[PDB]
Ligand binder design. Structure first.
Ligand SMILES: O=C(O)CCCC[C@@H]1CCSS1
Ligand SMILES: [Zn+2]
Ligand SMILES: [Zn+2]
Lengths: 336, 336
């Protein structure tokens, strides 16, 4: 019963690994929700609190810039650095109020976006040098479009600088090298980063497009690692499921059983969030200033009907429920 | 040319007074725009950076609570404290990117809501002792429902507590005491607060209901003030204009002429923020999960169209251009 299931807010350092080790010990996985706004982080935070579950808010490169604003110049990664930092401070400031452990993470960052990674990394080190924690709980490199030698080598390079801050790195490997990811590719990842810190999770290629899904390959990844490590460890790696959408429970369950701790969502939530707002097209007529076809045909105040605290909340309300479904489907509901 | 005009980020201390003395000297007022999310804050920072203007972002007790999330119980003022705090950090973190001075201020706090004020002023001090600045630039107490005997006293208590941090306090006085408000009771305020510190503005009752609007009473205050103190400067009082709605440009002008520095917006930013998103009802045939009216039936992805980053942006856009119009009316545009 690690400390993490009792804490409340963003969590760092050894509390991340413990939340993930419990993940595999009690066989569930944690949703990784891509946020873009104060209101999207609200909906996951409260979906998570209501099903008394842990949660992962994450910031993609483009999602980061949105937190800054699509109108802030982003040629130099300036917006994704700034707005990702802004999201961190905001999430950190709010999350404790919802009373659950949150993993603040940054999503896909390919080789051409490493300026953004670099920015967050300086941000972290500064924060670490005053507070004792980095700014973000976790960070991801998606260098899977590079050869695996290169991909891994600069994972290690960055990982070395993150390990001094006890920070979590997530790593995506694919099918380059010089068709799925051989367990051999995945173990190569492990023996490079495991000599730096255990604080790392791997997202491997296993038919998760983003020809079909072979999540059992993830088990073979783990068994191969089990052999070579020489441990009696059922789950020698920390695994991540990208492109979780339309995966039936059959596919989620053998993935969790194969040691996945994190299943990304994004696109599903995107639609969940809209539908509640979209379902303010029922108020079609009560939304163009003063005209109301209901009582007062052109002399009503639509203030009550147009105030964004009434219709945006219909977005928060719908997104959370999508998250609760995955929260249940992933078996993370009720885990604290 | 005060240094503050060239600053960038949330301003504190006498930089605020400087902004206001500047606004009073060059005869413009700054719009105070209520925010309720990261998305809404972006819309106003963008409007200001673009029209080369300073700007005041403010959180209402309800808007504060929204920043915490409508599902955070707010029974002991708990949501509005979290939400104003996390929005304090978010705005502070993102505002320097927009490159304009921002005053972080809070909206209506009446007697029933001092818990929210206490939690916010509690965090200011704590923060002030860490960093050298409070969290928020400014706070308001609106205690006009209480006898003006009691009003002046409760602000003087808080103002002594904020003046050590140099925080700005704005107070609303009504028409009680023990029909608009007198230049006499309005001078009463100044005569007490100015002992503590110069950093206060006055929100008087002059038919800005929120029987009609008398912006000329505000020059009456400045004329009364100057005599009883005996100063030269025509504007011995910082005046703020609540509920100035659909007021003519003549009406706003005579109030700015009498030293109004800050004119509160909100509910047409509310309506303006909506319309843009509402004008994505035009895209409803491409707004159900997989069926799309335009290309190949039932088999094209509606992802592009329902990414909240394209349609919420549209709301931010129509909200900002509503702020631009305001920045023109009040003559704050292009004053940096
Ligand atoms: O934009 C202006 O110049 C006047 C705005 C009048 C309405 C105010 C926005 C809604 S609250 S009061
Ligand atoms: Zn991926
Ligand atoms: Zn008022």
């Amino acid at each position: 019963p690690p400390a993490v299931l009792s804490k409340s807010g963003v969590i760092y350092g050894k509390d991340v690994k413990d939340l993930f080790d419990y993940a595999q010990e009690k066989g569930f996985a944690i949703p990784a929700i891509n946020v873009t706004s104060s209101s999207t982080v609200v909906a996951a935070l409260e979906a998570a609190r209501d099903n008394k579950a842990p949660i992962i808010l994450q910031t993609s490169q483009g999602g980061a810039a949105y937190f800054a604003g699509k109108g802030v110049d982003n040629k130099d990664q300036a917006a994704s650095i700034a707005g990702s930092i802004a999201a961190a401070h905001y999430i950190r400031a709010i999350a404790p109020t919802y009373g659950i452990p949150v993993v603040l993470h940054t999503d896909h960052c390919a080789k051409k976006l490493l300026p953004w990674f670099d920015g967050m990394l300086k941000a972290d080190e500064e924060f670490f040098a005053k507070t004792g924690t980095p700014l973000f709980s976790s960070h991801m490199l998606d260098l899977s479009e590079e050869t695996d030698d290169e991909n891994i080598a600069t994972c290690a390079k960055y990982f070395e600088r993150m390990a001094k801050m006890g920070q979590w790195l997530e790593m995506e490997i694919g099918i380059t090298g010089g068709l799925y990811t051989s367990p051999e590719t995945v173990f190569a990842v492990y023996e490079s980063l495991h000599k730096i810190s255990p604080n790392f999770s791997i997202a491997a290629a296993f038919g998760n497009v983003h020809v079909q899904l072979r999540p059992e390959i993830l088990g073979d990844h783990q068994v191969y690692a089990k052999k070579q490590i020489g441990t009696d460890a059922k789950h020698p790696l920390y695994l991540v499921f990208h492109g979780g959408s339309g995966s039936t429970q059959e596919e989620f369950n053998t993935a969790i059983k194969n040691g996945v701790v994190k299943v990304n969502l994004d696109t599903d939530c995107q639609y969940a969030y809209l539908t509640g707002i979209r379902d303010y097209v029922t108020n079609k007529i009560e939304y163009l200033k003063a005209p109301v076809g209901n009582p007062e045909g052109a002399d009503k105040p639509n203030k009550k009907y147009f105030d964004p605290r009434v219709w945006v909340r219909e977005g928060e309300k719908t997104m959370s429920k999508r998250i609760a479904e995955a929260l249940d489907i992933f078996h993370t509901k009720g885990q604290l």
